[PDB]
Design a protein around this ligand. Structure first.
Ligand SMILES: C=CCNC(=O)[C@@H](NC(=O)[C@@](O)(CCCN(Cc1ccc(Br)cc1)NC(=O)[C@@H](NC(=O)OC)C(C)(C)C)Cc1ccccc1)C(C)(C)C
Ligand SMILES: [Cl-]
Ligand SMILES: [Cl-]
Ligand SMILES: [Cl-]
Lengths: 99, 99
């Protein structure tokens, strides 16, 4: 699809069998989701946003569908203001910016 | 242009007679730049991201050129860790997400 930016680019994602709403965010290196349960072991990561730094849980190799497009990659879980899909997964689904 | 998301999508902007590098950020409602002088009225704003909020000055009706494309809009100025071009200006240069 082609998504214009007059509104927030919110899409439906599916992760762990559940649907959620997430923001397609070309300014984000990483994908960060609000608190949820994921399988397996996690590693620590400190990520920086416009307000400062937060600690998150890093899960690797997680299947996630984004607008119907299948991806499998690193998902960070922590106290983010919104679910954000970053470039690590935007590249998996073949996203570019065009103007 | 078509801009890949393998790397951060950084572009050159011209604003207030200055050249600066900024990140094209579909996740950002607003355009926010590191401290600089701009002419005209402003009012204070709090803006929130990962890690919480920062206080910025909001300037309206500011001319900007982004990757060669002229636009005008609101520019927020304050202690952002990095220069971000948000949707308010991305729309004006006809920037879309595509996959
Ligand atoms: C939600 C209300 C509106 N709120 C914004 O609309 C705000 N938008 C945002 O905060 C975001 O779009 C992110 C802006 C881009 N940011 C640049 C950045 C780069 C380095 C450092 Br150190 C600090 C900042 N990237 C990040 O934070 C990411 N870090 C990063 O990749 O490390 C390299 C991450 C933490 C999301 C992974 C995300 C966002 C979107 C919507 C809401 C909240 C957050 C606003 C426009 C007001 C700044
Ligand atoms: Cl990944
Ligand atoms: Cl504007
Ligand atoms: Cl349009």
């Amino acid at each position: 699809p082609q998504i214009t930016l007059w509104q927030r680019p919110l899409v439906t994602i599916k992760i762990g069998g559940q649907l959620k709403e997430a923001l397609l965010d070309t300014g984000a290196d990483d994908t960060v989701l609000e608190e949820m349960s994921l399988p397996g072991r996690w590693k620590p990561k400190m990520i920086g946003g416009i307000g400062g730094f937060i600690k998150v849980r890093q899960y690797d190799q997680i299947p996630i569908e984004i607008c119907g497009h299948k991806a499998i990659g690193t998902v960070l879980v922590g106290p983010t203001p919104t679910n954000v899909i970053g470039r690590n997964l935007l590249t998996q689904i073949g996203c570019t910016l065009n103007f």
